């Protein structure tokens, strides 16, 4: 009925995908009642820079909730390291990074 928010991307998670294909990048989210405002950012060195005006959605499958970043389609430059983030109470929660490998 009540729990803390978790953005539980596992450490060293990666995906490799064909350029020109659609892709759905998943942020597994644990929440209990009050669905968090999850955002995506892409790593530029030390900084995780928030992604603006991107297509996002929510997915639920076998009692797991995912926040999705859509790539329609993947481009070569989409290569890199991504994190999901959310405010919970007065905390900023940040997931481990997930790495994308695009085959050009």
């Amino acid at each position, epitope marked *: 009925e009540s729990c803390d928010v978790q953005l539980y991307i596992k450490r060293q998670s990666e995906h490799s995908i064909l350029a020109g294909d659609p892709f759905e990048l998943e942020c597994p989210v644990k929440y209990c*009642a*009050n*669905r*968090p*405002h*999850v*955002t995506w950012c892409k790593l530029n060195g030390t900084t995780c820079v928030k992604l603006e005006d991107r*297509q*996002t*959605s*929510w*997915k*639920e*499958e076998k009692n797991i909730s995912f926040f999705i970043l*859509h790539f329609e389609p993947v481009l070569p430059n989409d290569n890199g390291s991504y994190r999901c983030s*959310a*405010n919970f109470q007065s905390n900023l929660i940040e997931s481990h990074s997930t790495t994308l490998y695009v085959t050009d």
Partner: antibody
Amino acid sequence: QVQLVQSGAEVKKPGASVKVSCKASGFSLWTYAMNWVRQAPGQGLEWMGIISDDGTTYYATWAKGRVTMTRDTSTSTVYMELSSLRSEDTAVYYCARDAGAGGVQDYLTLWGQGTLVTVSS
Amino acid sequence: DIVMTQSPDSLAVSLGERATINCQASRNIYNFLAWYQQKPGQPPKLLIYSASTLASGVPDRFSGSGSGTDFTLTISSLQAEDVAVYYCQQGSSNSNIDNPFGGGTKVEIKR
């Protein structure tokens, strides 16, 4: 308890703007996002957009460039401004508390009483 | 865009009989689907969220089912106070969408 109290009925001429307010009681604008929804007389519910925990706004396609959603977190008040009013904007404008913190609307758990805006010569 | 379609437009059921109304999404919205009841001159009231969870205080004659793109609200035995307009609403995305609400279904007593 938790309440939403909206500003009073407005009467507007074609071409005017309107700014409707919605004062929230008993929760923070950082906990639950606010949605704006309108309804023309005898018609369906039309979602206009959502203002998130951190103030980020997302709008229905038709509402982009017409609707501006703002907030003042010190009073827990949210605002909906609609520009270049036309007779077909005549509607009851509702604020509604989201179950969630924003980004994507989740579902709506609490409604304001609505504000009638009549646009006419 | 995710287009939400309700059917039928209106439904007439005799007092005490079963009322079933449909909501369809143009693309997969999983279980991010809520149902509302609205009476004349009132704001909508939430009945069901996550496709099938009854909101606090809602009579258990109300039930929701479905997942993906096909959803139903069922009133097992229609009562006078159930005469209303019912809306479904998707909570999966708002990326370039027109309306997360369906167009509504009017439920009336058949006599």
